[PDB]
Design a protein around this nucleic acid. Structure first.
Lengths: 282, 282, 282, 282
DNA sequence: GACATGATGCC
DNA sequence: GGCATTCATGTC
DNA sequence: GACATGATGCC
DNA sequence: GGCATTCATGTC
């Protein structure tokens, strides 16, 4: 139905793969040729299906009737998730060989910042597959199901988690703190203290976030990257990044990684996916 | 040449009219058959042009190639500006009579909540034409002209206005406090303190807002209305509203307005743009 | 066994009577000729007895054995409780006829600024009789008893009230918010944010107290008057006072009292205990 | 004239010796057999003199006519300055070896928390001698010279120092930050933010003090020691202490010292005054 | 990983 | 010594 | 109109 | 009485 353009190359397998390693049971559905999920925009809802057209470097988007009144915003969310805006060779041109291996690499964003906020928090300490299982449990319990599509369930809204009880959340399998951090986050959402859109001054914006309970500099950096699609942010405290720069302290990794300015968010993703990348043997 | 749907009726005359009176030179163009303006999404810039198609119950939108990478968000910004989600058959069924004469009414939104904030402030205690000239100045002095279309100019981003001299602003015609308020607002917009999207709790959000220098309840409400497009807001502190509700106080008005919940914003528009209106004896 | 003299006149039947209506059971004993109470200065405990020797305008203070390692401090407390520094000449000369009735009128302070804080808050709304009852109940629940004087119980420390259960204090006959105030006051005392001695800028000090939950303008003034023995404070928003100035709004009364600087506290006392008194409608 | 009791033993030579080394010209006078200094309690000023009576186990204290109205408080201040409450049997008993050679050791207090704070600040980084003359200059400038005894000047009041030009002090001989520190301390004092008396939670009060500009943990501690006469503080950051504990980080010294509570303040002193002192190797 | 705590230089 | 910043610890 | 100040009910 | 909210009122 609706269609959006992107600029070649676009590694859809990599993107669809990435999104799939984090897909949430009953909220998302990832296939080799399309991504599909529940979606809410105020009281409006339904399902969004995105199908790439490698041939016409186009992305087709289908909305269920429930979402039609807000079609546009839906489209905007998808474009932010997929990073259509990305001009692959402006980025690659500044990343030399670091990306040469896969020039179609895009920044996996999100369809909702609050959700991404919840996602980045449950991702603390644990594995990607576990954070997925976890987020599913939280969704299963606090997320509202679709009348129109039973098989689907909407991601928990801010006000549903705000009223949630720590003990209940904790029960799902997370420490008491993690749960409280989630209940705080939802309140800043209702109050509009959590930026749902990429702020002008990202750093300051991030600092503000780290004052939030349960949100450290890692949670803040990663959220900046996914929730805001911040393109020039690196992660010196990331598990892997540590293991990718063996023998270095957070400020040398940051001080090192600052050579990929202003596209560090991309340099980060490349390093994550270059199987055996060791800093330049110089 | 994209296209967006809308449910009829839709008083296009009324809308454009409303947008024309407050149109800012170099920034916006409003003809009786189309609306066009300068737009900026981050660092992407160009010019938007919407052309209502009454036959099709459709809004056509063309995009300056400089905005094609971010077409989706652009389309979303227009849909918010024109209130494309509105199911009038629902709103009017709710207000009954008050909206019987102008069933095609829509809430005139904005293209960017920050811009609309600036606009709200510069709209304080002055005629519409007045403010649309004051503002036009600001956009002339702190705006990013386009190369693709020199004729237009982008609204001042928060970074260009954040680092502005109070006197520099004041000198275009506004108390110093007013120039100060825009400076503040601009800051919250850099550290994500200014909610760029309708928050869950709009009362709370507004209350917070009010602590912002240069912002009172009137400005908060008008901001929530145009900036967030909140549908159940009313301005009992407004100049004309006082006139429409003779000898009645903010409180009296406010609760009389309670009869229109959850669509007090539409009710407002109907009363404003309906000269000679007056409350009942019950 | 200890003497501290005073300048005449000194209305003792009035001082004691006052301290009598407000006397707290099991903590204070007040008769026609002497005053006695439990007293604790840190880990030092014991009873204090005050016996005025009108004939030789000297006050006889006796101290239980446990307080002797801190006699000086006890004496100082006793002297702030009885306003022995007062110079009847200066206040009465400055006041004129206002105090011609009772020149021995003194400013009744306290023995511990925290205690007084707990009294002031409790002295809220209820009658003086009620207050003493309510206060005594708290002392019974949180006070330290004395081995040598089983009939006496020490007034509760901040260390016990900070740890108090608001519901426990509530069950004693006070609104939840009122108990939440005691606890806050108690905590303030622990971190040292409650002035235990008259502060350089009484005014600013008081303004800061009002920021405390539970403390309004009245409590903050009555605290300053009794707890710091500030001599130039007035209670324009007090009950009885309002009666003393019929038809006058706090600001009026208050503008009137300016005529008494800097002995407004003393002024207040006389006007309070001069039943007839009325302003000069000139 | 007045007499205060003290429990034996009391090493008067050491005590008077310690005050002497830090005696401030025109403020204090220290001699083999007595101690004298100016003293103002509100608008009551005069000179205080303390003369120990080894024979009768007592401290004699005379006050100039100016302070007689507030004499009891002068006695209390003196009792705090000379630690008259101290029971050597208790402290020493518990302290063991440490206080075995000089069992008459006492905690040199102060006669005014504020002044003491000032002293703690001015005494930073420089030698006891510097601080003394440094302080002296401050007193001669913002002080209140006594008419009855012109060679004496009352240590400057908060209101006075709060309103001093930070550059005037810089001139007296101190960094501009050491000066703003005084202006700040003085403001806190004007409004009651500076605990003029020992708090319930001494730990929490010190933590708070360090927020004060110019005040660190060292000062915050030294302040709790002399200003509040806290008996359980240690100074693991003192230049000399670090020397008495060679090759031990503050946290280590700190933990070792835990063996002297609740009298770590005394232990400190003892240790301070023992050249070849060193912790037990085991 | 969040978070409190413990271990160079500058001015 | 206060103060800023960057490692390095160590529960939970 | 924002924004100080003063001057009715619900706890 | 604390306290949040409301109706003038004067100012910039």
């Amino acid at each position: 139905m609706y269609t959006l353009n992107w600029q070649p190359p676009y590694d859809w397998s990599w993107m669809l793969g990435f999104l799939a390693a984090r897909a949430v049971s009953s909220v998302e559905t990832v296939a080799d040729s399309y991504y599909a999920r529940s979606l809410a925009v105020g009281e409006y809802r339904g399902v969004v299906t995105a199908i790439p057209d490698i041939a016409r470097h186009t992305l087709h988007i289908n909305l269920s009737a429930g979402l039609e009144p807000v079609a546009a915003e839906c489209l905007a969310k998808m474009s932010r998730l997929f990073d259509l805006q990305c001009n692959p060779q402006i980025v690659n041109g500044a990343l030399g060989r670091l990306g040469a291996a896969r020039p179609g690499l895009r920044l996996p964003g999100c369809v909702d910042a609050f959700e991404q906020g919840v996602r980045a928090i449950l991702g603390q300490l644990v594995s990607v597959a576990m954070a997925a299982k976890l987020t599913a449990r939280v969704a299963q319990l606090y997320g509202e199901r679709l009348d129109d599509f039973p098989e689907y369930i909407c991601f928990p809204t801010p006000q549903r988690l705000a009223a949630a009880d720590p003990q209940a959340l904790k029960a799902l399998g997370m420490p008491l703190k993690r749960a409280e951090a989630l209940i705080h986050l939802a309140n800043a959402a209702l109050e509009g203290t959590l930026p749902m859109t990429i702020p002008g001054d990202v750093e300051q914006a991030m600092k503000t976030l780290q004052t939030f309970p349960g949100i450290g500099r890692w949670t803040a950096n990663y959220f900046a990257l996914r929730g805001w699609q911040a393109k020039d942010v690196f992660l010196p405290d990331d598990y892997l990044i540590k293991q990718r720069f063996p023998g270095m302290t957070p400020a040398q990794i940051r001080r090192y990684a600052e050579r990929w300015k202003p596209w560090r968010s991309y340099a980060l993703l490349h390093i994550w996916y270059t199987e055996g990348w060791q800093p330049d043997e110089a």
